[PDB]
A paper describes a structure:
In stark contrast to most characterised dehydratases, Pac13 is small (121 aa), monomeric, co‐factor independent and utilises a non‐activated nucleoside, rather than a free monosaccharide, as a substrate. We demonstrate here that the reaction most likely proceeds via an E1Cb mechanism, with H42 acting as an active site base, however, unlike many other dehydratases, no metal or cofactor is required for activity.
Mutants E108Q, K16R, H42Q, Y55F and Y89F were produced and purified, affording diffracting crystals of the same morphology and space group as wt Pac13, which raised our confidence that the mutants folded correctly and that the effects seen are specific to interactions with each mutated residue rather than global effects on protein folding and structure. Finally, the significant loss of activity with mutants Y89F and Y55F is consistent with their proposed involvement in stabilizing the oxyanion and underlines their important role for catalysis. Although there are subtle shifts in the position of both the ribose and uracil rings, of the substrate, and in the orientation of the 5′ functionality, these changes are small and consistent with our hypothesis that decreased catalytic efficiency of these mutants is largely due to inability of the phenyl mutants to stabilize the transient 5′ oxo‐anion that forms during catalysis, rather than having a major effect on binding competency.
Numbering used by the authors: 1 to 121
The structure:
């Protein structure tokens, strides 16, 4: 009766600002968990007024820019970002992303686009 398991095969997969997102389709007000694959960067800076963003780095290496501060990231690191923090990042990484409470695009604000040449990856 209750669906507990979600697969990649049945997920929604799309590119957003240079990252490949896997959105599984589960609904839970307390948190959203998605996969993020990135080859060079997330070429847009945004913030979320409600939700914290927590990235677990499965593999690879990159750099987060959090309110313009560089934060290097590598495999097995956890990057925790409070609400109302400007975010972008560069890197070649596979990550698991938690947005808590649940992701709502109406909570997000566009700051600026980032030139693809700005990524050193
Ligand atoms: O469920 C989610 C979680 C994050 N993002 C997007 O992922 C990027 C940051 O990893 C941002 O563009 C953010 O809007 C989504 O589209 N959906």
């Amino acid at each position: 009766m209750t669906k507990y398991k979600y697969t990649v095969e049945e997920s929604e997969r799309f590119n957003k600002h240079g990252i490949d997102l896997t959105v599984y389709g589960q609904v839970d007000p307390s948190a959203t968990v998605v996969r993020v694959s990135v080859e060079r960067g997330h070429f847009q800076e945004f913030f979320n007024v409600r939700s914290s963003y927590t990235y677990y780095v499965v593999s690879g290496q990159g750099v987060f820019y959090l309110n313009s501060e560089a934060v290097p990231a590598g495999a097995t690191d956890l990057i925790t970002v409070p609400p109302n923090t400007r975010i972008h990042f560069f890197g070649s990484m596979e990550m698991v992303l938690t947005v808590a409470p649940a992701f709502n695009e109406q909570d997000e604000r566009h700051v600026r686009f980032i030139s693809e040449s700005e990524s050193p990856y």
